[PDB]
Amino acid sequence: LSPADKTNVKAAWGKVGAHAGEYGAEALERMFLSFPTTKTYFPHFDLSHGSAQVKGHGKKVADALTNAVAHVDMPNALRVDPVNFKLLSHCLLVTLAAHLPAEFTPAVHASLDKFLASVSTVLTSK
Amino acid sequence: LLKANKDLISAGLKEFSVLLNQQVFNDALVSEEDMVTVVEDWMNFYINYYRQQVTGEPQERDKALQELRQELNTLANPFLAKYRDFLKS
Ligand code: HEM
Numbered sequence: 001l002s003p004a005d006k007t008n009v010k011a012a013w014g015k016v017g018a019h020a021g022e023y024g025a026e027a028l029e030r031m032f033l034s035f036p037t038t039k040t041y042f043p044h045f046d047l048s049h050g051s052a053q054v055k056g057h058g059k060k061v062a063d064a065l066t067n068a069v070a071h072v073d074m075p076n077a078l079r080v081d082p083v084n085f086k087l088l089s090h091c092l093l094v095t096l097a098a099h100l101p102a103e104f105t106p107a108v109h110a111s112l113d114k115f116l117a118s119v120s121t122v123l124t125s126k
Numbered sequence: 127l128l129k130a131n132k133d134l135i136s137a138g139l140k141e142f143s144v145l146l147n148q149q150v151f152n153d154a155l156v157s158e159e160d161m162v163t164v165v166e167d168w169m170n171f172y173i174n175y176y177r178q179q180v181t182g183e184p185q186e187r188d189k190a191l192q193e194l195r196q197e198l199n200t201l202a203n204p205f206l207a208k209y210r211d212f213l214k215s
Protein backbone atom coordinates (compact mmCIF):
# COMPACT_ATOMS: atom_id res chain seq x y z
CA LEU A 1 0.00 0.00 0.00
CA SER A 2 3.11 1.97 -0.92
CA PRO A 3 3.67 5.76 -0.56
CA ALA A 4 4.96 6.00 -4.10
CA ASP A 5 1.63 4.48 -5.04
CA LYS A 6 -0.09 7.25 -3.09
CA THR A 7 1.71 9.87 -5.20
CA ASN A 8 0.68 8.17 -8.44
CA VAL A 9 -2.97 8.00 -7.41
CA LYS A 10 -3.45 11.65 -6.45
CA ALA A 11 -1.59 12.68 -9.61
CA ALA A 12 -3.58 10.48 -11.99
CA TRP A 13 -6.96 11.40 -10.53
CA GLY A 14 -6.07 15.08 -10.42
CA LYS A 15 -5.47 14.74 -14.12
CA VAL A 16 -8.92 13.14 -14.45
CA GLY A 17 -10.53 15.94 -12.52
CA ALA A 18 -13.59 17.20 -14.41
CA HIS A 19 -14.34 13.81 -16.03
CA ALA A 20 -14.81 11.48 -13.06
CA GLY A 21 -18.56 11.20 -13.66
CA GLU A 22 -18.25 10.58 -17.41
CA TYR A 23 -15.54 8.05 -16.74
CA GLY A 24 -17.61 6.41 -14.02
CA ALA A 25 -20.34 5.64 -16.55
CA GLU A 26 -17.97 4.68 -19.28
CA ALA A 27 -16.47 2.13 -16.92
CA LEU A 28 -19.83 0.56 -16.07
CA GLU A 29 -20.47 0.31 -19.77
CA ARG A 30 -17.20 -1.52 -20.50
CA MET A 31 -18.10 -3.94 -17.74
CA PHE A 32 -21.46 -4.75 -19.31
CA LEU A 33 -19.62 -5.32 -22.57
CA SER A 34 -16.45 -7.09 -21.53
CA PHE A 35 -18.34 -9.05 -18.88
CA PRO A 36 -21.77 -9.59 -20.55
CA THR A 37 -23.06 -11.95 -17.89
CA THR A 38 -22.76 -8.96 -15.52
CA LYS A 39 -26.02 -7.58 -16.95
CA THR A 40 -27.89 -10.67 -15.77
CA TYR A 41 -27.86 -9.56 -12.16
CA PHE A 42 -29.82 -6.52 -13.29
CA PRO A 43 -33.31 -6.81 -14.78
CA HIS A 44 -34.94 -3.97 -12.84
CA PHE A 45 -32.64 -1.25 -14.01
CA ASP A 46 -31.85 0.54 -17.24
CA LEU A 47 -28.54 -0.77 -18.52
CA SER A 48 -28.93 0.74 -21.96
CA HIS A 49 -26.36 3.05 -23.49
CA GLY A 50 -26.92 6.44 -21.98
CA SER A 51 -29.24 5.19 -19.31
CA ALA A 52 -29.70 7.84 -16.62
CA GLN A 53 -29.26 5.29 -13.87
CA VAL A 54 -25.84 4.41 -15.18
CA LYS A 55 -25.00 8.10 -15.65
CA GLY A 56 -26.15 8.55 -12.11
CA HIS A 57 -24.24 5.61 -10.71
CA GLY A 58 -21.14 6.72 -12.55
CA LYS A 59 -21.18 10.04 -10.78
CA LYS A 60 -21.56 8.06 -7.57
CA VAL A 61 -18.59 5.79 -8.09
CA ALA A 62 -16.61 8.85 -9.17
CA ASP A 63 -17.41 11.24 -6.31
CA ALA A 64 -16.86 8.25 -4.03
CA LEU A 65 -13.48 7.51 -5.58
CA THR A 66 -12.47 11.16 -5.23
CA ASN A 67 -13.18 11.09 -1.50
CA ALA A 68 -11.45 7.74 -1.08
CA VAL A 69 -8.54 9.61 -2.60
CA ALA A 70 -8.44 12.52 -0.16
CA HIS A 71 -8.55 10.07 2.74
CA VAL A 72 -5.92 7.61 1.51
CA ASP A 73 -9.32 6.30 6.33
CA MET A 74 -11.04 4.79 3.34
CA PRO A 75 -12.48 2.17 5.61
CA ASN A 76 -13.28 5.27 7.77
CA ALA A 77 -14.17 7.22 4.61
CA LEU A 78 -16.65 4.49 3.55
CA ARG A 79 -26.54 -6.44 -1.40
CA VAL A 80 -25.18 -7.00 -4.94
CA ASP A 81 -22.62 -9.73 -5.79
CA PRO A 82 -19.00 -8.62 -4.95
CA VAL A 83 -17.55 -9.49 -8.34
CA ASN A 84 -19.25 -6.42 -9.75
CA PHE A 85 -17.03 -4.22 -7.63
CA LYS A 86 -13.94 -6.16 -8.52
CA LEU A 87 -14.77 -5.90 -12.21
CA LEU A 88 -15.95 -2.31 -12.06
CA SER A 89 -12.48 -1.38 -10.81
CA HIS A 90 -10.79 -3.31 -13.57
CA CYS A 91 -12.73 -1.40 -16.22
CA LEU A 92 -12.23 1.81 -14.30
CA LEU A 93 -8.55 1.29 -14.82
CA VAL A 94 -8.99 0.54 -18.51
CA THR A 95 -11.07 3.69 -18.85
CA LEU A 96 -8.43 5.86 -17.19
CA ALA A 97 -5.58 4.34 -19.20
CA ALA A 98 -7.55 4.94 -22.43
CA HIS A 99 -8.23 8.61 -21.68
CA LEU A 100 -4.76 9.31 -20.29
CA PRO A 101 -2.45 7.08 -22.31
CA ALA A 102 0.29 9.58 -21.43
CA GLU A 103 -0.07 9.63 -17.65
CA PHE A 104 -0.38 5.88 -17.32
CA THR A 105 3.08 4.40 -17.15
CA PRO A 106 3.19 0.63 -16.39
CA ALA A 107 3.84 1.78 -12.83
CA VAL A 108 1.16 4.43 -12.29
CA HIS A 109 -1.14 1.77 -13.72
CA ALA A 110 -0.13 -0.89 -11.24
CA SER A 111 -0.31 1.73 -8.50
CA LEU A 112 -3.94 2.40 -9.45
CA ASP A 113 -4.83 -1.21 -9.86
CA LYS A 114 -3.82 -1.80 -6.25
CA PHE A 115 -5.66 1.33 -5.12
CA LEU A 116 -8.86 0.25 -6.86
CA ALA A 117 -8.47 -3.33 -5.65
CA SER A 118 -8.60 -2.03 -2.09
CA VAL A 119 -11.46 0.41 -2.53
CA SER A 120 -12.96 -2.63 -4.22
CA THR A 121 -12.35 -4.65 -1.07
CA VAL A 122 -13.44 -2.10 1.55
CA LEU A 123 -16.70 -2.28 -0.36
CA THR A 124 -17.19 -6.02 -0.66
CA SER A 125 -15.23 -6.91 2.49
CA LYS A 126 -18.42 -5.20 3.73
CA LEU B 127 16.79 -6.00 -32.83
CA LEU B 128 18.14 -2.62 -31.66
CA LYS B 129 19.00 -2.13 -27.95
CA ALA B 130 16.79 0.81 -26.88
CA ASN B 131 13.93 -1.44 -27.88
CA LYS B 132 15.34 -4.73 -26.51
CA ASP B 133 15.79 -2.99 -23.16
CA LEU B 134 12.35 -1.38 -23.30
CA ILE B 135 11.01 -4.94 -23.49
CA SER B 136 13.01 -6.14 -20.51
CA ALA B 137 11.69 -3.15 -18.57
CA GLY B 138 8.21 -4.09 -19.70
CA LEU B 139 8.26 -7.82 -19.02
CA LYS B 140 9.29 -6.94 -15.46
CA GLU B 141 6.77 -4.19 -14.81
CA PHE B 142 4.09 -6.44 -16.24
CA SER B 143 5.03 -9.31 -14.01
CA VAL B 144 5.23 -7.02 -11.03
CA LEU B 145 1.53 -6.40 -11.70
CA LEU B 146 0.77 -10.10 -11.98
CA ASN B 147 2.36 -10.59 -8.60
CA GLN B 148 0.49 -7.83 -6.90
CA GLN B 149 -2.62 -9.91 -7.62
CA VAL B 150 -4.01 -11.66 -4.50
CA PHE B 151 -6.12 -14.53 -5.82
CA ASN B 152 -8.37 -14.41 -2.76
CA ASP B 153 -9.20 -10.73 -2.49
CA ALA B 154 -10.38 -10.76 -6.11
CA LEU B 155 -13.28 -13.18 -6.59
CA VAL B 156 -13.51 -13.40 -10.40
CA SER B 157 -14.21 -16.01 -13.09
CA GLU B 158 -11.87 -18.09 -15.29
CA GLU B 159 -13.50 -16.60 -18.36
CA ASP B 160 -13.30 -13.14 -16.83
CA MET B 161 -9.71 -13.43 -15.72
CA VAL B 162 -8.70 -14.28 -19.26
CA THR B 163 -10.47 -11.13 -20.39
CA VAL B 164 -8.60 -9.17 -17.70
CA VAL B 165 -5.08 -10.32 -18.57
CA GLU B 166 -6.15 -9.58 -22.14
CA ASP B 167 -7.06 -6.03 -21.20
CA TRP B 168 -3.75 -5.79 -19.40
CA MET B 169 -1.41 -6.72 -22.22
CA ASN B 170 -3.28 -4.49 -24.62
CA PHE B 171 -2.50 -1.62 -22.26
CA TYR B 172 1.14 -2.62 -22.19
CA ILE B 173 1.44 -2.89 -25.97
CA ASN B 174 -0.14 0.54 -26.04
CA TYR B 175 2.13 2.29 -23.59
CA TYR B 176 5.35 0.71 -24.67
CA ARG B 177 4.44 1.34 -28.32
CA GLN B 178 4.52 5.03 -27.38
CA GLN B 179 7.99 4.56 -25.92
CA VAL B 180 9.40 2.16 -28.54
CA THR B 181 11.91 3.78 -30.91
CA GLY B 182 12.70 4.17 -34.59
CA GLU B 183 11.99 2.61 -37.96
CA PRO B 184 8.91 0.40 -38.67
CA GLN B 185 10.61 -2.84 -39.77
CA GLU B 186 12.39 -2.56 -36.44
CA ARG B 187 9.70 -1.04 -34.21
CA ASP B 188 6.43 -2.85 -34.90
CA LYS B 189 8.64 -5.94 -34.93
CA ALA B 190 9.50 -5.22 -31.29
CA LEU B 191 5.92 -5.03 -30.12
CA GLN B 192 5.87 -8.54 -31.55
CA GLU B 193 8.32 -9.86 -29.01
CA LEU B 194 6.88 -7.59 -26.35
CA ARG B 195 3.47 -8.99 -27.15
CA GLN B 196 4.79 -12.54 -27.09
CA GLU B 197 6.94 -12.38 -24.01
CA LEU B 198 3.89 -10.92 -22.26
CA ASN B 199 1.90 -13.91 -23.52
CA THR B 200 4.56 -16.26 -22.29
CA LEU B 201 4.21 -14.70 -18.84
CA ALA B 202 0.43 -14.54 -18.66
CA ASN B 203 -0.25 -18.12 -19.70
CA PRO B 204 1.36 -19.47 -16.49
CA PHE B 205 -0.37 -16.88 -14.29
CA LEU B 206 -3.60 -18.03 -15.85
CA ALA B 207 -3.01 -21.72 -15.23
CA LYS B 208 -2.47 -20.71 -11.62
CA TYR B 209 -5.80 -18.89 -11.19
CA ARG B 210 -7.22 -21.65 -13.33
CA ASP B 211 -6.32 -24.30 -10.73
CA PHE B 212 -6.67 -21.83 -7.86
CA LEU B 213 -10.38 -21.37 -8.43
CA LYS B 214 -10.62 -25.17 -8.55
CA SER B 215 -9.15 -25.59 -5.02
C1 HEM C 1 -18.00 2.99 -5.43
C2 HEM C 1 -19.10 2.80 -6.13
C3 HEM C 1 -20.49 2.88 -5.70
C4 HEM C 1 -21.11 3.78 -4.87
C5 HEM C 1 -20.57 5.00 -4.12
C6 HEM C 1 -22.48 3.34 -4.86
C7 HEM C 1 -23.42 3.95 -4.20
C8 HEM C 1 -24.71 3.62 -4.15
C9 HEM C 1 -25.66 4.41 -3.51
C10 HEM C 1 -25.35 5.69 -2.78
C11 HEM C 1 -26.85 3.83 -3.67
C12 HEM C 1 -28.19 4.40 -3.17
C13 HEM C 1 -28.65 5.11 -4.42
C14 HEM C 1 -29.85 5.97 -4.67
O1 HEM C 1 -31.01 5.54 -4.95
O2 HEM C 1 -29.52 7.19 -4.72
C15 HEM C 1 -26.63 2.61 -4.43
C16 HEM C 1 -27.57 1.74 -4.82
C17 HEM C 1 -27.44 0.62 -5.64
N1 HEM C 1 -26.25 0.26 -6.19
FE1 HEM C 1 -24.44 1.19 -5.92
N2 HEM C 1 -22.68 2.23 -5.62
C18 HEM C 1 -21.51 1.94 -6.15
C19 HEM C 1 -21.30 0.87 -7.02
C20 HEM C 1 -22.21 -0.05 -7.50
C21 HEM C 1 -21.93 -1.14 -8.42
C22 HEM C 1 -20.58 -1.42 -9.01
C23 HEM C 1 -23.12 -1.80 -8.60
C24 HEM C 1 -23.41 -2.97 -9.44
C25 HEM C 1 -23.26 -3.06 -10.74
C26 HEM C 1 -24.11 -1.11 -7.80
C27 HEM C 1 -25.45 -1.45 -7.70
C28 HEM C 1 -26.43 -0.82 -6.96
C29 HEM C 1 -27.81 -1.23 -6.93
C30 HEM C 1 -28.38 -2.41 -7.69
C31 HEM C 1 -28.49 -0.34 -6.10
C32 HEM C 1 -29.99 -0.40 -5.80
C33 HEM C 1 -30.67 0.94 -5.42
C34 HEM C 1 -32.21 0.81 -5.25
O3 HEM C 1 -32.70 -0.34 -5.20
O4 HEM C 1 -32.91 1.89 -5.25
N3 HEM C 1 -23.52 -0.09 -7.17
N4 HEM C 1 -25.29 2.56 -4.74
Ligand SMILES: O=C(CC1CCCCC1)N(CCO)C[C@@H](O)[C@@H](O)[C@@H](O)[C@@H](O)CO
Pocket residue numbers: 028042045052053054056057060
Ligand atom coordinates in the same frame (compact mmCIF):
# COMPACT_ATOMS: atom_id res chain seq x y z
O1 LIG D 1 -29.57 0.20 -9.88
C1 LIG D 1 -29.25 1.33 -9.97
C2 LIG D 1 -28.06 1.73 -10.85
C3 LIG D 1 -27.47 0.56 -11.68
C4 LIG D 1 -27.36 -0.88 -11.01
C5 LIG D 1 -26.86 -1.87 -12.11
C6 LIG D 1 -25.46 -1.46 -12.53
C7 LIG D 1 -25.43 -0.05 -13.16
C8 LIG D 1 -26.13 1.03 -12.29
N1 LIG D 1 -29.98 2.24 -9.28
C9 LIG D 1 -31.16 1.86 -8.41
C10 LIG D 1 -32.03 3.11 -7.94
O2 LIG D 1 -33.28 3.20 -8.67
C11 LIG D 1 -29.78 3.63 -9.44
C12 LIG D 1 -29.37 4.75 -8.54
O3 LIG D 1 -28.01 4.69 -8.23
C13 LIG D 1 -29.81 5.76 -9.56
O4 LIG D 1 -31.23 5.56 -9.74
C14 LIG D 1 -29.84 7.24 -9.35
O5 LIG D 1 -28.61 7.86 -8.99
C15 LIG D 1 -30.38 7.76 -10.78
O6 LIG D 1 -31.60 7.17 -11.33
C16 LIG D 1 -30.60 9.24 -10.89
O7 LIG D 1 -31.12 9.46 -12.21
